Design an enzyme around this catalytic site. Structure first.
Site, PDB file in Angstrom:
ATOM      1  CG  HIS D  31     -34.530  30.758   9.978  1.00  0.00           C
ATOM      2  ND1 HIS D  31     -33.679  29.896   9.949  1.00  0.00           N
ATOM      3  CD2 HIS D  31     -35.699  30.363   9.668  1.00  0.00           C
ATOM      4  CE1 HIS D  31     -34.097  28.767   9.775  1.00  0.00           C
ATOM      5  NE2 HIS D  31     -35.568  28.801   9.572  1.00  0.00           N
ATOM      6  CG  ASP D  53     -32.406  36.058   8.930  1.00  0.00           C
ATOM      7  OD1 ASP D  53     -32.799  35.502  10.066  1.00  0.00           O
ATOM      8  OD2 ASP D  53     -31.637  35.213   8.163  1.00  0.00           O
ATOM      9  CB  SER D 105     -27.371  29.103   9.620  1.00  0.00           C
ATOM     10  OG  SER D 105     -28.594  29.264  10.557  1.00  0.00           O
TER      11      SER D 105
END
Lengths: 153, 52, 152, 153
Positions: D31, D53, D105
């Site tokens: 992402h 992802d 993240s």
């Protein structure tokens, strides 16, 4: 010795050498690839020479102070380097073997009084000393000294 | 047309050889810290006007 | 060495100086004005555009108050009326600011006390402004001008 | 060692995440937009996968050593994390809620010995402990485990 005078050249984020700012001349080993790390110096009309392998240009007047002093008189004896010392004898420059490795091909060679006598180009390994393929300044000439069986840094 | 073309190629090739000679003799003196450029070559070839 | 540097006057104010060296009175040509000493002001002076040095022959009487000269210019440290100057690599360097536009005649001495240069201008750069100066090689007088030097 | 193994990924000067150098593949959350910081891993081919992802590639062989070890065993317990640590219970990774905020993240998750178990992707807060939407490796399969309602960090 003089931090603010040796500038690195980058090639996709890799320091492939350095370009020195000596004697009213910005200079670099032509055969090393990349672009000068400084943005201010990057937009300069460099000028190549295959037979000499030294790409140079004029140091812009805005940074002229960070320039080393230069000499052509090279008495036989001992001189400085950014990896230890170099010994000048018989028209050859000799270093302890290995000290200095490919990928740092641009760094200069200073003199006892602190002024640039040569620009390293390459290595030639034979014995306990490696002979430094170097580009020098005669009184008016610029000279290549490549020992037999040298290798490009 | 052919003769004139050959004359042009001759002129251009010769002039390019001349400017190449200019380079091959003057570039050893532009990469040195000290712009000597002795006036012999300075006159014989158009000198870059080195800027002390 | 106070009675060897004569100032040049323009409408009541010193706009540069004319130095007295080597059986020759000399001055930066580009600065305008008149020699303060009237005896020396009525001498004919031969200018030179391409060298910016206007000189003449000192009158026979006052030769004594003239400095000694040299042409041999070793690498090292030389004097100035504003502190010191450094000679290195065929250039003259001063601390920036030490040189003000308008004191554009004064000489540069050597360690032994003999004129080696005649300042004309400055090329401002970093901590050390270069001095565009007219020197005398062994038989020629030569201008050394770094780029962008501004006439003082 | 593990403190200079995860290379941050930049996007106009804001730390938008990290790409970890895991096993033999240098993975990256597929992402997080931007360009990798150390420029070299940003020039390697980059096989993306929306369904997982986790966009990865084959590590340039120069930096092979500086890459952490991998594990598939995830026994019930307590695991390490650069913002503290996580606790693996009930098929979920639990952290103190609030610990970690949107924008970072990429970071790995290590085990007590230290072998990168997993790569976090985002959070989901319900109660004092936020669950981590996180990618693992099974014995042969990368796997997403994302709890409901997770919003990407």
């Amino acid at each position: 010795i003089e931090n603010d005078c040796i500038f690195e050249v980058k090639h996709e984020g890799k320091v492939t050498g350095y370009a020195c700012l000596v004697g009213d001349k910005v200079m670099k080993p032509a055969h090393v690839k990349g672009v000068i790390d400084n943005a201010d110096l990057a937009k300069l009309a460099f000028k190549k020479s295959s037979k000499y392998d030294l790409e140079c240009a004029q140091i812009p007047v805005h940074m002229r102070s960070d320039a080393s002093k230069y000499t052509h008189e090279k008495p036989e004896g001992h001189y400085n380097w950014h990896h230890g010392a170099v010994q000048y004898s018989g028209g050859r420059f000799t270093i302890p073997t290995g000290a200095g490795k490919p990928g740092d091909s641009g760094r200069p060679i200073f003199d006892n009084k602190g002024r640039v006598v040569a620009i390293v180009l390459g290595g030639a390994n034979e014995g306990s000393r490696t002979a430094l393929s170097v580009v020098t300044w005669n009184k008016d000439m610029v000279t290549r000294v490549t020992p037999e069986g040298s290798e490009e840094w | 047309v052919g003769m004139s073309l050959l004359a042009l190629i001759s002129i251009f090739a010769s002039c390019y050889m001349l400017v190449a000679a200019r380079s091959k003799c003057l570039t050893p003196y532009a990469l040195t810290p000290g712009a000597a450029v002795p006036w012999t070559l300075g006159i014989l070839c158009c000198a870059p006007r080195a800027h002390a």
